[PDB]
Design a protein around this ligand. Structure first.
Ligand SMILES: [Br-]
Lengths: 193, 193
């Protein structure tokens, strides 16, 4: 049962990422797993509950991933570079995660439970970036500048570049996004020195 | 005429898509709001995707006309750039609604080639307008020398990311904060010292 739910969520996430939440029907999820629509309904009374529980799950996976990746890193510049690297829409899992987040931005403007979940996840991320900046400022590697405003700018820049990648802007690519962000950190965050 | 019927359908459909979400709008919603039948709507737009596509085409043209009217008497590049950025704010009403729709387009683009092409052409024009404005300011000596293309990439991405924060309701975000943040970026990263 914890298992059944798990399979539904993993399958729903992928379908939502690749086909679009509103284009995914409950039979599409059943067909993808071999169950029936009634089973799916038993665990999730509505389509929205699937999205919401899938999202909850994903936010957890992503924060785990981030802890694993940053756990040994003490140098704030390296930490920030790695934080930024985790946000790239690389082929496979991360690109799929971006696809779903793009939809959640829209669904947030309409659904309060989704908006709440989105804002809590974003705030956690945002505080992380700010904390990291402040650390680098205390270590002397980062320029003394309001961390909150800088975190706001970097977060916003990450989101905008992601969109340009996902939508196919000419000359855009994950690598160019990476370079652009690394240049932002080296030239706007790092202490010229 | 019949140019009239088309127009009205598209103005209505745009507003509904913005406030309710594309996938939540039905043909009957549009018909009810205008007092026609579904058959008239279908005649002009065989499918819902055609409505979205044609509504987007129309909005892209309106928005560019709005831009020319606002900028045509402005020769100072700094003032032009400030006004250009002002037109991108999600201010109450039509501009907010347009953001609503563009957020949906970002997702729909990852799935529909015609919407993707239209979005890329419209983005490209805006991007070139930004780069051109930067280059004029450089020639006038009011903007710092820097790659206008990288700067146009950065500015455009920043705008998009800040808009998402406004629309999604990030704590402390408001159209006023976004304006201030973007004007601070221009004065400190674009304007010459
Ligand atoms: Br030019």
């Amino acid at each position: 049962q914890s298992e059944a739910r798990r399979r539904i969520l993993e399958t729903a996430w992928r379908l939502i990422a690749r086909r679009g939440y509103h284009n995914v029907r409950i039979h599409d999820i059943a067909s993808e797993l071999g169950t029936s629509n009634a089973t799916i309904h038993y665990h999730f009374p509505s389509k929205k509950d699937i999205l919401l529980e899938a999202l909850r799950r994903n936010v957890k996976l992503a924060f785990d991933r981030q802890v694993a990746e940053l756990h040994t890193i003490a140098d704030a510049r390296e930490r920030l570079v790695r934080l930024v690297e985790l946000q790239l829409p690389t082929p496979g899992l991360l690109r799929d995660e971006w696809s779903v987040w793009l939809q959640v931005w829209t669904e947030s403007t309409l659904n309060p439970k989704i908006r709440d979940l989105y804002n809590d996840a974003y705030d956690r991320w945002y505080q992380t970036i700010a904390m990291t900046i402040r650390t680098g400022q205390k270590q002397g590697v980062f320029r003394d500048q309001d961390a909150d405003e800088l975190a706001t700018r970097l977060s916003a820049l990450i989101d905008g570049l992601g969109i340009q990648v996902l939508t196919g802007k000419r000359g855009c690519s994950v690598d160019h996004m990476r370079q652009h962000l690394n240049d932002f950190i080296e030239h706007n965050i790092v202490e010229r020195r």
